[PDB]
Swiss-Prot record:
Primary location recorded for the protein, binned into one broad class: mitochondrion
Domain of life: Eukaryota
Protein name: Protein SCO1, mitochondrial
One example GO MF annotation: copper chaperone activity
Shown segment, full-protein numbering: 111 to 282 of 295
Length: 158
């Protein structure tokens, strides 16, 4: 009985474009919370996410929409997020906004530096399907993700 994680939110990507929960529709999305000034933890996770994406694209032909939402809207402005994610996978898009907008998002995912231990996988309907924690390595994470994308049905049982 998975919790009611996720929900409507209104942010902007590291380029200023509007991005809301509607942007999650039509694809599998993997979301990660953290901040550019986050110590050792976040950098390792984003590196791990990069291995998953690479193996997923080249081995299973699956492409995800990787999103990095900041929790420190005070310092992580768009420009700052682009700088920060230049050391990581190009596919990753950082999202940010005002205190209120960022506050809402973090809340909808029940995220209240050591809480950035989960990746949230969302289906083409924008629904929560699984939370991958630190116990998944570069191998087991790929496995789990692959069975979710392969067993997903439009929930419209056409
Ligand atoms: Cu946070
Ligand atoms: Cu947060
Ligand atoms: Cu927060």
């Amino acid at each position: 009985g998975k919790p009611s994680l996720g929900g409507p939110f209104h942010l902007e990507d590291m380029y200023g474009n509007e991005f809301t929960e509607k942007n999650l529709l039509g694809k599998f999305s993997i979301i990660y919370f953290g901040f550019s000034n986050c110590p050792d933890i976040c950098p390792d996770e984003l590196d791990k996410l990069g291995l998953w994406l690479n193996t997923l694209s080249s081995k299973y032909g699956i492409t995800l929409q990787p999103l990095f939402i900041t929790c420190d809207p005070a310092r992580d402005s768009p420009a700052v997020l682009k700088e920060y994610l230049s050391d990581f996978h190009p596919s990753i898009l950082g999202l940010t906004g005002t205190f209120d907008e960022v506050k809402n998002a973090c809340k909808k995912y029940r995220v209240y530096v050591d809480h950035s231990i989960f990746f949230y996988l969302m289906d083409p309907e924008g629904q929560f399907v699984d939370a991958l924690g630190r116990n998944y390595d570069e191998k087991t994470g790929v496995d789990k993700i692959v069975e979710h994308v392969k067993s997903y049905v439009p929930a419209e049982q056409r």
